[PDB]
Amino acid sequence: SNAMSLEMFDKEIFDLTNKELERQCEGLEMIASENFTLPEVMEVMGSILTNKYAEGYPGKRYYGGCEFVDEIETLAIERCKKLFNCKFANVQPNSGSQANQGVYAALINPGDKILGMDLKMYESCFYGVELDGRIDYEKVREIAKKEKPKLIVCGASAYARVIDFAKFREIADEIGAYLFADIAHIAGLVVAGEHPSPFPYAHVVSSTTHKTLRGPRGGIIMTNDEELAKKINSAIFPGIQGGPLMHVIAAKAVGFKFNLSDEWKVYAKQVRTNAQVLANVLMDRKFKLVSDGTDNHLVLMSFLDREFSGKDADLALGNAGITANKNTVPGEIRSPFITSGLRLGTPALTARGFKEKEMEIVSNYIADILDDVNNEKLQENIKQELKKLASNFIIYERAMF
Amino acid sequence: NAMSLEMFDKEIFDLTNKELERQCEGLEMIASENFTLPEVMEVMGSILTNKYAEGYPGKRYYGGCEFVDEIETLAIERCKKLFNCKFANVQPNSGSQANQGVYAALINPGDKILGMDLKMYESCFYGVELDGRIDYEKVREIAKKEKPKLIVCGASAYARVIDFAKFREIADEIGAYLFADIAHIAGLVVAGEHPSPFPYAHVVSSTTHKTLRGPRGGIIMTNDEELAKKINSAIFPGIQGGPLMHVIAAKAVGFKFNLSDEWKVYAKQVRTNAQVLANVLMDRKFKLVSDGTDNHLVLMSFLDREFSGKDADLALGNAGITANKNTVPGEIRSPFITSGLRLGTPALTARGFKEKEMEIVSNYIADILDDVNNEKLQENIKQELKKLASNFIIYERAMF
């Protein structure tokens, strides 16, 4: 009778949590930025580490009694350093947003200009992608030379191709800017060698730990520069946060141990392979993909040549048990609330054990639906077939660990 | 249990168990510490960590949010009931993010904030007088001189009731917002053991662990619909992305407990226990800031002593009691050394201590501070306290 105390005490929450597990098991999760956490990561999250208030850093805490949490945090930091092969890591950020805020606070001053990708504490300017779905680095260079930002940021949620960190660094160097790489969406590939590292090109790198690394939700910051490391540490605490979430930090350490394993490289490679199958099938079925394929874990479909919208596609897929998300595309002609595109990713399906054959099956069904997007009976039928298919790939026997 | 973790990552498994043993064997008296409910921890280690839910219930960026929307709605509704307010935001990742959200909602970068003292905005401060209480006329003249756009009240080491009405009167005189950060007293407030900041504060923040025994995290509350909208926008997408859904479910569970009859009993015992601690220390001839307390904490002053707050903190630590050094009115030492000691009762109360046990521990504290360099006494008391602690165990395991 697992979590029987919760069931007796707060049956509503208990029931809702099990329904969410049922939803994760029965449907196909193809939101590019989602993944399935390890049971071992979840086990340590529901722990008495939540009771410890540990403001400061290991060996340098504000309160006493931190002998064991200091060892836990040190383990997280050391594994993070090994994973990214870097000299400094901060594992305290509560989220990707706080990680990025910490980097900004460390590197620039309020009011300073940031140049970032688009697909008031600081001044923002943006670069984007061309109609062919790729960054034009000469244009970025031109934008940088005219705007003169103090900081250039790279990384994006819906970019299907390799980010050329070396070119970004060449550009930053021309105008004397810092280069900050936010690799939250591709970090799991980076640590496996399935995407080039942002080091040594980025001065500072941030990531989240759940999306691609399959750890708990949270942020991390990495650097090789000791002075920047000190500034990052101060910016996170006391600058932006108080005491860290120690149960999450322990969870991060557990996740990193998995990321360091041989199994991780196998997983990361399969993520890319699965995305290749997804892309190839959709294109063979005569759908347009932004950039005509992918280098990573995601595909972005374009419906500029089609009858239906991105929101239409998202809702049809949803009705067939497939969770994705509408997304704007280059040459966009519709409201950002409607879009003419759909983003799909493979990390979560790969995590539950889908391989090329399963990807081909799902990809063809996606195609079937979008070939007949108004046929609600077709969606119902596919929903049942997919629930059956998914029943062979169950990674969670329970909702709480 | 947690056998899978034990097999996969023995180092983390072992360290987590050692931390459990430390919490069991020691006497936790850091005023801001507490013990989370087992039921809260159960839902924290759940598959809700897997859902990305940017936005608010019924208005998310992603589909598939049917069930997490119902969870967050439940947390919001329970929070509104607990604080008797018309709007709540339960997404803040921490007290720090909650407060940043409030600043971002109410004022502009560079604007001035007046807050309590013991880059984005300008900060000014008021403090406490030698008698250990806020002089509200002094606060008023600071406010008139500085003209902040926002006044903040709430403090981590203030032992007396905060006069929210007077703070609002001061704010009104200068056309400022009043923000009450009640993280350190929220558990007393929701039980009626401290006056509510509403309707005096425009916006109220709190954390969910310290005094409410929920998970670590933040919340924001208001009665003003226009401010609620600004608050929600500030939190997302201003300050955060996706919320921690496993934590939001945990906050909901915690609120359910806070709403129960047992909560009021707990909160009253917290105050009673703090009265015992205060009375014993003063009977033993120690000075307390403001000569007592109205809440969960006491602040000892050592201006009349040869040892520092740091010395006291280390002496208690050696005897197995966790506390923290703290500056005091009339402070004469570095703030990294201090002339005081903050002590609180929430954690000991949570594990079942009542008056009799408080009297034992308070007299041990007095014994130590009467002979601060007596290392053997500390060792002996540590032994006695471990025995006392063994009779008050609330966790049978480290992971739920």
- Is the link from the previous residue into A238 a cis peptide, with omega within 30 of 0? yes
Contact A17, B46 (CB under 8 A): yes
3-state SS, B292-338, equals CCCCCEEEEECCCCCCCHHHHHHHHHHCCEECEECCCCCCCCCCCCC
Cα(A175)–Cα(A104) distance, rounded to whole angstroms?
A: 18
Nearest CB among A12, A53, A68 relative to B32 is that of A53
Q: Say which residue the tokens 């936005």 belong to.
A: B55
In chain A, which segments carry CATH 3.40.640.10? Answer: 38-260
CA distances from A248 to A95, A217, A255, A288 (A): 11, 8, 10, 41
Beta-bridge partner residues of A325: A343
Beta-bridge partner residues of B399: A47
Contact B17, B193 (CB under 8 A): no
Breaks (C-N over 2.5 A) in chain B follow: 118
Cα(B317)–Cα(B394) distance, rounded to whole angstroms?
A: 22
**CB-based contact, A34 to chain B, within 8 Å:** yes
As given in the structure block, the two tokens for residue B299 are 């602040």
Q: Which residues, in sequence order, are CB contacts of B226 under 8 Å at separation 6+?
A: none
Q: How many residues does chain A have?
A: 401
Question: Which has the closest alpha carbon to B358: B264, B278, B263, B292?
Answer: B278
| First vs last C-alpha separation in chain B | 9
As a CATH number, domain A38-260 is 3.40.640.10
Beta-bridge partner residues of B344: B297
Amino acid at B398: A
In chain A, which segments carry CATH 3.90.1150.10? Answer: 261-401
H helix runs in A27-149, sequence order: 39-45, 67-84, 96-107, 137-147
Largest CA distance in chain B: 64
As given in the structure block, the two tokens for residue B241 are 């992305």
Q: How many alpha carbons fall within 13 Å on the CB side of residue B250?
A: 36
As given in the structure block, the two tokens for residue B202 are 């425009």
**CB-based contact, B121 to chain A, within 8 Å:** no
Q: How many CB atoms lie within 10 A of CB B372?
A: 19
Contact A63 B11 (CB under 8 A): no
Cα(B16)–Cα(A247) distance, rounded to whole angstroms?
A: 9
Question: Which has the closest alpha carbon to B30: B314, B325, B294, B318?
Answer: B325
Cα(B142)–Cα(B250) distance, rounded to whole angstroms?
A: 41
Candidates 3.60.110.10, 3.30.60.50, 3.40.50.620, 3.40.640.10; CATH matching B37-259: 3.40.640.10
| Shortest CA gap A359–chain B (Å) | 21
In chain B, which segments carry CATH 3.90.1150.10? Answer: 260-400
Cα(A207)–Cα(A154) distance, rounded to whole angstroms?
A: 12
Cα(B51)–Cα(B195) distance, rounded to whole angstroms?
A: 38
Please tell me the experimental approach by which this structure was elucidated.
X-ray
A261-401 has which fold? Answer: Aspartate Aminotransferase, domain 1 (3.90.1150)
Cα(A89)–Cα(A226) distance, rounded to whole angstroms?
A: 10
Amino acid at A96: G
Chain B residue with CA closest to A28: the answer is: B64
Interface of B with A in 326-365 (CB under 8 A): none
Cα(B245)–Cα(B99) distance, rounded to whole angstroms?
A: 20
Q: How many alpha carbons fall within 13 Å on the CB side of residue A272?
A: 18
CA distances from A182 to A203, A206, A209, B58 (A): 11, 5, 12, 29
Q: Is B210 a catalytic residue?
A: yes
Q: What is the DSSP letter of A111?
A: T
CA distances from A320 to A81, A216, A337, A366, B213 (A): 42, 29, 22, 9, 42
| First vs last C-alpha separation in chain A | 12
B38 is in an annotated binding site: no
Q: Is B356 a catalytic residue?
A: no
B260-400 has which fold? Answer: Aspartate Aminotransferase, domain 1 (3.90.1150)
H helix runs in A185-286, sequence order: 187-192, 226-234, 246-259, 262-284
Handedness of CA B12, B14, B17, B22 (dihedral sign): negative
Cα(B84)–Cα(B73) distance, rounded to whole angstroms?
A: 16
A287 is in an annotated binding site: no
